[model samples]
Target: LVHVASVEKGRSYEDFQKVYNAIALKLREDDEYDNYIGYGPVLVRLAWHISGTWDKHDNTGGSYGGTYRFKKEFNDPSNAGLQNGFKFLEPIHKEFPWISSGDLFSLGGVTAVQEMQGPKIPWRCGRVDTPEDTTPDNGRLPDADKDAGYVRTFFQRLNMNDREVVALMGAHALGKTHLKNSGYEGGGANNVFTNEFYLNLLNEDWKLEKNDANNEQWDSKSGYMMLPTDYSLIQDPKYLSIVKEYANDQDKFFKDFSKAFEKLLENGITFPKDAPSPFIFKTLEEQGL
Candidate 1:
């Protein structure tokens, strides 16, 4: 059965924003993670991984269920490093006991993006938890070793178009890949969000190399690495065009990524037309924090 975020009665923007503020404040407090990379990147990754399990055809796994709390789903090999994000949210969950697991997970991502000065993603709430039986099996997330064709085909399961896929990938600017976690290593400067992923792709003199784990990765002396899937964006003519477009225009990338990310997080869930329009949150910066 398709699970939609069942709107919680009496809940409004103020309620969700409180949750967002808690997450944002904690992100500031927790600066020692990953050598000061902070919780932003991992939070974004956790949000993506939770929602990325969606399969449009079957409606099996998506953020609506909040099934990541199940051991089976939480332990999915693809989700190795996500525990940090989960642990970080535990306290927020205690403080705001009314929010559902799914909403918290998705909102964490939205909060991180805005806090890191990435984009203003409009988010809505109302996800409810489900039993462990609802969790989808492993192997749904994408593989980094594939090519452009693979990248294109993989996102199709989530009903994402070429432009959306390329735009969503611009999020790579935030975090590094851990060799122990995904058998890949290196990424852009931690915590700051920019079109740097695209800029690095265009500017870096990357060479193909095998990491200590013997996994093939694109490495550079500048200490950045790109997966074959990351490299595919430039190799494929269609994807290449969009990558260059984002590299040159930060505003365009932010706008496009905001839409794509919201779509990614809401893939399997439906919202009523009369449901409140997406909420554009104010960053702490805007609040003069």
Candidate 2:
């Protein structure tokens, strides 16, 4: 059994707020990662990727168990490059030993998104660490090579509907698929954490060609790449219309992305409606002001 202690007594909201500021400051300092683009976005994505493994059916996998620090979690073929994010958080975890791995990992995601000017994902602090055998089975994540039908089906196992699936993937607009990371190349060279993903899909003139390895995919004139699963959003009539809408409206995409991302983070927990709306956490600079 995993032992998860409660947030230390006498440690009120202000203490956590200070800790949040520490995370914020580190994120700003670490902004030069990924060829000087900052590690904030991918860190958020890693938290999501790790948690996204949860299945509502048996609860075998979810963010509640911060098992990603283990070798099996780190060696997960799909998570080849996330070691960067894991290493980044190691020091912070050492400084705050009382914080559970589950809290630290998920808090990294929350802090990254808020500091990057995204919505304040209402987060709770109760996740307990679990044992190694509880790690999820492989194949829970969606494959990049598949089509719309596959993407839709894969999400059902995780309890996401089409709208949530599309919105969740919209985060892809912020980061590119690194060749070494996902065996794909140059999706977003200027992966600056924005809603530009929808815009790119509509505006770019893509060529249907195989790469050096000859896997069929759509390539753009701008050297960006989109996975077949990503392209399916536009290729399928139903998904395409929403894609176009987000392309035209940044606000819509932001609203939907915030909700979906929050849902992704809060996959297994139950919360009351009267529960507070997430506090719109402040970045380091914002907190000072």
Best candidate (score: TM-score): 1
Q: lDDT of each prediction vs. the true structure?
A: 0.90, 0.74
- Please give, for residues 182-221, the per-residue lDDT of candidate 1 as tens digits: 8887665668778888898999998999878888999888
| Shift in Å, residue 196, candidate 2 | 1.0
lDDT of 1 at 257: 93
Instruction: Write candidate 2's Cα lDDT for 152-190 as tens digits.
Output: 888887788877887777777665667677777655565
Q: Residue 212, candidate 2: how far off, in angstroms?
A: 3.6
lDDT score of residue 262 within candidate 1: 95
For each candidate, give its TM-score against the true structure.
0.97, 0.90
lDDT of 2: 0.74
Q: Cα miss at 215, model 1 (Å)?
A: 0.4
lDDT, residue 227, model 1? 90
The TM-score obtained by model 2 is 0.90
The candidate that achieves the highest lDDT relative to the unseen native structure: 1
Name model 1 segments beyond 4 Å from true.
none
> How many backbone clashes does every candidate have?
0, 2
Question: Which residue pairs clash in candidate 1?
Answer: none
